[PDB]
Amino acid sequence: VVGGTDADEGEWPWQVSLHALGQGHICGASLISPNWLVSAAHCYIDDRGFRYSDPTQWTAFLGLHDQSQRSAPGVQERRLKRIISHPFFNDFTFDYDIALLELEKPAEYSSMVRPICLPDASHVFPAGKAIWVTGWGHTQYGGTGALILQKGEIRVINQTTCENLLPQQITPRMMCVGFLSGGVDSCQGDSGGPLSSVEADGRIFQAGVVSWGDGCAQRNKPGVYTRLPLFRDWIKENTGV
């Protein structure tokens, strides 16, 4: 991400690094239980002769902190049994950009690998509410990724403001998070990563999936993510979680 700083060992135990055969890190995901993740959709769309949807081509990294660090005490490694892109995702308008990734062998909770909490159907994240974005995405539009899971703080925005900042593009399943003056925002490589929100009760809840946005950290161009409530029941209905 852009405008943020380095996170700490386990500061975001639910973050995950997803890699694809011959390509290294591609996207991020969110651990929502011992056997499931919550990533983007575009991340797994067969293109240019590569089965980005085929689970046999993916490896997930739980508790990852440093991308260049090989074999780590607190990092789990797992293959994927299957991917479930939403039945109404749109590779062009970006609608329903959300997918579920099932781990083969379970994750084993620990200090550095814990599951984030899912907002219940009706939860609300009022505009103006600060939340966090994490990932190994590019650190400035048009640059390179980061070795260390960066963290950045942005905030929810009024929906119409969103809709109008990105004319004839926003859909109910989407939500602008960031700042109008930019400076901080998610970027390439952060996709599928979870927006972490500290709730009044003390626990963090996923409030969105990194999806897209015009540029990165641009003024009047806040990041666009997938609302997490509308799909709670879809999750329940598929994963079973």
Binding site: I26, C27, G49, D190, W212, G213, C216
Partner: protein, 56 residues
Amino acid sequence: RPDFCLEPPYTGPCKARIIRYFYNAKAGLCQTFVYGGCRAKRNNFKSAEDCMRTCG
């Protein structure tokens, strides 16, 4: 020859980090760039091979 071969490497609005190859016109060699994961353009392949076989 393909005119799309001479257009600049388009990343896209999405935020995936897929290294892809594109033909560098005024450089005769295909190179690397990052594809956001959506709205790909014709001058974006998977391997240097694929790239150099259609834009050579």
